[model samples]
Target: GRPVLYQVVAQHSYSAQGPEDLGFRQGDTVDVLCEVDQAWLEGHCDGRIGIFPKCFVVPA
Candidate 1:
């Protein structure tokens, strides 16, 4: 079966900060799952949410 997958890049919260604060950086690869409510996306201001983690690790 071809399972559905979603790829999202990290976005900075503020202009003064770096991408690492948001969990990713430029030229970095972070593999994560996608499982979120499409309807809930309409009622938010600004923040990261619904990021399903298969497993996360920092590159050495």
Candidate 2:
């Protein structure tokens, strides 16, 4: 079965001005959920790349 992806909103987010903003700092353990509909990936995208952490990983 194909996996589903989910967008992440940082829990410890903070900002100087505006909503709590948790910058994508290096070494953050993020969750990359898959989606049933490709459209689910729209808008919520921070960016797109061929290679990135949690984007692809060999199953343990």
Candidate 3:
């Protein structure tokens, strides 16, 4: 299945704070695994599956 992919905005970088966090740098892309109501997104990046800030990305 192909989920919507998002590109990490160039202005921000997110570092994982815990095992359940999806850490990524600016310009990295993630495949969205699921959605949340506000300020959240569950996605996979670089072989890790976890949650990330929705504000950090935009639909690719």
Off by over 4 Å in 3: 1-11
lDDT per residue (tens digit) for residues 21-59 in model 2: 223433333344443243321112243211133332222
Query: lDDT value for candidate 1?
Result: 0.30
* Model 1, span 1-60: residue lDDT tens: 223243433343222144322333443343333333542111111333233222332221
Off by over 4 Å in 1: 1-22, 37-60
Q: What lDDT score is found at residue 31 in candidate 3?
A: 78
In candidate 3, what are the lDDT values of residues 1-60, reduced to their tens digit?
647555444237889999989898888878788786588888888888888888888777
Which candidate gets the maximum TM-score versus the true structure?
Answer: 3
Clashes of 3: 0
* TM-score: the better of candidates 2 and 3: 3
lDDT of each: 0.30, 0.30, 0.78
Location of the lowest summed lDDT over 10 successive residues in candidate 3? 2-11
- Which one wins on lDDT? 3
- In model 2, where do residues sit more than 4 Å from their true spots? 1-23, 35-60
